[PDB]
């Protein structure tokens, strides 16, 4: 069994840097975690919990997968991000359209997490993702999601005037999850094998 201290469920799944009940920290970069209560209920009836890599960070040869960091998630005094998820940003002056698909060939259900960044203002949208008007498409055999980033200035939480929205689903065996985005995509690197 894995008993957590201080760090939240959302925090541990995403890989909050200071993280390694009442949690002091939920999300280091401010935002929301959709269907959080439902996820906790689901993570209750589990016989086996295991972490797996499904999309290697190095597989992003056209995008920048390490430079994107925030002061909201510090590590050793300097800026950092969630370990298990990837903050993709523009490489050079370009952010090519992402078309990526992972198929679950395991015998167990996979817990996949992903997110969208709602930037502070228009100037920041261009700075991070280059493209002004962007979208995120997440598809499975049972899931159809299309996201548009809401560009707005919000009150500073952990020094941030922007927000992030995180989503999750259960990928069945032999089912594949598909991603398409031209910006604001916080891409999964690690998923979780679960057993009822």
């Amino acid at each position, epitope marked *: 069994p894995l008993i957590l201290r201080d760090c939240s469920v959302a925090g541990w799944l995403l890989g909050n840097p200071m993280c390694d009940a009442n949690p002091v920290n939920d999300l280091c970069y401010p935002g929301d975690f959709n269907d959080y209560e439902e996820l906790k209920h689901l993570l209750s009836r589990i016989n086996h919990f295991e972490k797996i890599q499904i999309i290697p960070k190095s597989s992003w040869s056209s995008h*920048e997968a390490s*430079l*994107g*960091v*925030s*002061s*909201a998630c*510090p590590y*050793q*005094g*300097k*800026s950092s991000f969630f370990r298990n998820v990837v903050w993709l*940003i*523009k*490489k*050079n*002056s370009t952010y090519p359209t992402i078309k990526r698909s992972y198929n679950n060939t395991n015998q167990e259900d996979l817990l996949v997490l992903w997110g969208i960044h709602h930037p*502070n203002d228009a*100037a*920041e949208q261009t*700075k*991070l993702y280059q493209n002004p008007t962007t979208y995120i498409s997440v598809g499975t055999s049972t899931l159809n999601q299309r996201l548009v980033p809401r560009i707005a200035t919000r009150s500073k939480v952990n*020094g*941030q*005037s*922007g927000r992030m929205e995180f989503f999750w689903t259960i990928l069945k065996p032999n089912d594949a999850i598909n991603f398409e985005s031209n910006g604001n995509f916080i891409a999964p690197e690690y998923a979780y094998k679960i057993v009822k």
Partner: antibody
Amino acid sequence: QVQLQESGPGLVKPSGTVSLTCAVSGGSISSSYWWSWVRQPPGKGLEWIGEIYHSGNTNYNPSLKSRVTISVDKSKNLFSLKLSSVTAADTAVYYCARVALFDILTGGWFDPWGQGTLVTVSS
Amino acid sequence: YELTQPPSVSVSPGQTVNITCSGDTLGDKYVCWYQQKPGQSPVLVIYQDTKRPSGIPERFSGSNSGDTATLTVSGTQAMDEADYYCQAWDSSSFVFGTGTKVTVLG
């Protein structure tokens, strides 16, 4: 308002060691800021020497890493600079500054700066 | 990593002056700008590409795109005559530009 103050000798013989200290007022060293040293030879550009965090973690200019050391005193709310094996090329005005991290992306900005202090290296 | 600046630029009082800063893939980095007058310490005028510190006149503005960052001073004044430096960060090192001397033509 935060104020920073450099202090030290100002005259150093060749092959000797430049030893400077930066007093921090209006704020605490134990912050999310980084503390840096920058020098400028007369009529020339600024050159980053290095930086330190209140935990003791440091980062130096690769070209100076051989002969530079930076420490920090959380109790006395100051941090210091040691530059050994000095030459005529080390004659410069030395600044200490406070560095703050961007909300997003690597790097940071320098504010505020100290008044600076001249160190002359000549035998 | 090198940040390249023109050594000097001229501008008539009231006019607009441009100060350029060049480096590899600078458009992905946040750039800051400092004003230094003879015998004084550097002063932050622009941080995070376009942001102004409190107490800095609105006529100062900045921008970044491609491999070139630009500090812009419109309606320039005599007290704006100084050296200007850009700065960025790369591979555990902070980097300052070579510096640009701005003369207001008197």
